[PDB]
Each structure stands twice: as C-alpha cells, then as structure tokens.
Homo-oligomer: A and B are copies of this chain.
C-alpha cells in the first residue's frame, strides 16, 4: 500500500507542477533525468519525488540515493542548465525549502553501502588504484570484490570531481513537500482556478487527469510523454463538452418519444368512467417505496376525486410478497387513504377483493378508493373474472396468466415515477 500511495503522491505532484506551469513550459512525465522534467526556454527543472509518511523524522540517509544520482547526472551533464529538485515529504518536517550543506554532501559520499559506492560514489570519487578500477568495471562482482571495494572506499581519501559548492548553489534545491492530502487538495484548488467547479473536478476532471498522468507514466517512448497545461485543459474541456452535448441530445430524443406516447395515451384517460388496471414491477421504477404512496394519492386526486362522475375504482397489481403489501397498507392507512388488499393475514379472499365500493353522495364518501394487491394466481383469477377497459403494464411483467382477449394493453417504458405521471397526464412538463 505504501508503494501505491507514493506513486499517487508523485502523480499528484506532477499534476500540481503541470497546473502551476505556464503555457510555454514543456513537462515530461517520468522524464529522463528525474520523475518530473520541466523544460523551460533556458532552464530544465528535474524533480525527484519521495514519500516517507512512515518515517517519524527526516534523516540524511533517507535521501542518499536521489542526491547521489543527482550528483552523477550533474557531473555527466555539467554543461547543461539543469536544476535538480528533491521533493520529499516528512510528517514532522516543516514544509519549505531545506538547505543541504557541503558537509552533509560529503557525509553522503562517505556512505558504507556497497551499491551507492559502486554506482554513484565511484564515478563521483574515482579510485586512485587501478585494481579498484578494474574491480568496479566488472559486470559481475564477487562478494570478496565487493568487500574489497567497500573497505577501499571507507579507508582511502578520494578527491571529488563534482563541484559540490556550485551544484548546491545553482543546480540543487531540497524542498520538504506537503502531505498527500494537502498535495491533492492544492491540486484540486488549482484545478478550480482554471474555471472548473469543485464537484466537477472531483467527479470528472481530477480522475481524468490522474488517469492521464498514470497512462503517460507507464508508457516508455520518452518523446511522447512530454505534456503541457494547454493540452490537458483542452482534453478536459472537450470531454466535458462532448458529455454534456450527448446527454442533452439523449434527453431531447427521450422527451420526444415520451411526448408521442403521451399524446397516444391521452384520449382514453379523459373518459370519466373507465376501469383502469396497473400491473407494476417495483424493481423497474427508482425509489418505488418512497414515492409509491404519493403517486397513488395524485392518481386518486386526478382520476378518482369527483364522486358523481368517477364511478370506477382503479386497481394496482405489484410483483412483491404479502408482507410488503401489509407495509404499504399501513402507510396508506396512516395517510387517510382507504384501500382494499383482499388479504386477511396471509389468505386471499375472492369475495373481499371484487366487491364494489359503496357511495354516499351527500357525505362525499366512498368506501375504498383503490385496490392494491400482489401478482398471485388468485389475484390474476380475480382480474380475469372482471375484465377492465385498459390494462397498463409497467416494467414488462409476465402476463401469461391473464385473459388478454379484447383487452386494451398499453405497455409503458419508464424508469421513474416522473415519467409515469407525465404519460398519465398528471404533470405538464418533466
């Protein structure tokens, strides 16, 4: 997990450098020199990323290898105007530029590690003995040769070819980096500074930029991996514009289809005395439990409100179990809506489900306003016994047991209650 977190920290640092750079700056992700190679008009900036969240206090030995590699690169490329930066984070170190003294650099060159001595210290401090040079030139080194080289470099005083003073003064800088949370928070804040919204960056822009950095990091052919602020900004803007335009086009097409379907459905919904049955699959409508009672309430307010004119009672059939039906009945009772389910406990009753409600016109009273039950065989038999005028089907429920002869079947393709209300003319515009 530590390696992945460090890679994420490095990628966020590269993204921050890209955002903070100007339009004339060429930045190479996973560059030849270091992790970040910011190429300006005349100065090339090399940044090496290190993550040390698990280290309580920063130590000189923790940065031996990056400093040695920077010194070797400077020795091999002294004629080039390259500034080397070491970006390392330590939890207990103040964020800012930390000075590295010449004595500290000399201490690095005195490290006892064989790998550093053989790779970087040997080129920085050439051995004065030809035997040591021949041993260092061997591709494969035995343990005795390693011990001999280590002892020689520990005991012998060797001059430094690399100009430590000039390197530290002009081409080296050490900065204590921010924490990962702080780093990517600052990166997002910079992403807002380009005209993007907070949640927009969090959902689209930041993941896209992270994926772009990760994709360019792994890929080897160094020429193509130089990036710029303008390219990333244009990529993000084009992605956002294309997504918004295609979403708008899809919405327009869906609205046209739904308007056509609504105009098809209107004529039969204006008759005041039609029996309408609804067979609904709860898993095809989003937020069914939270919005089902309100939908039935609106349907009764529009189509079953006038006591004298609305004489037929709607029926809703669900694909659920009996306990869900009991819960829905409880919620309807708590909202002063009178419905019948036909279930007494767990046993269905044919005579309690097909009965016609009583009306007292003077008191504006109807015994029950709707029938709500599940799609059991008994309920299907009851529906077949008393046929309806319209049979609205929502969700593609199996209707193989229904006697559909001479019955108007209307299939509704919806994904939420808003579209259902639109089709049934309960709203004017989505």
Contacts and interface: CB of A to CB of B under 8 A. Distances in A.
A48 to B, nearest CB: 15
Given A406-B294, A406-B334, A428-B263, A199 B1 contact: no
A203 B243 CA distance: 8
For the complex, would chain A's binding face be called helix, strand, loop or mixed by DSSP majority?
Answer: helix
Contacts of A30: 1
A293 interface: yes
Contacts of A424: none
Contacts of A246: 197, 199-200
A239 B200 CA distance: 9
B219 A1 contact: yes
Interface in A295-315: 301
Contact of A4 (B217, B247, B294, B408): B217
A137 interface: no
Interface residues of A, number: 50
Given A387-B335, A408-B294, A203 B242 contact: yes
Nearest to A245: B199
A57 interface: no
A383 interface: no
A426 interface: yes
A242 B198 CA distance: 11
Interface in A198-253: 199-200, 202-204, 206-208, 210-211, 214, 217-220, 239-240, 242-244, 246-247
B218 A4 contact: yes
A267 B426 contact: yes
* 8 tightest A-B CB contacts, nearest first: A207-B207, A5-B218, A203-B239, A207-B211, A1-B218, A293-B406, A4-B218, A207-B208
12 contacts: A1-B30, A1-B217, A1-B219, A8-B214, A8-B218, A200-B243, A207-B207, A207-B211, A210-B211, A266-B428, A267-B428, A331-B406
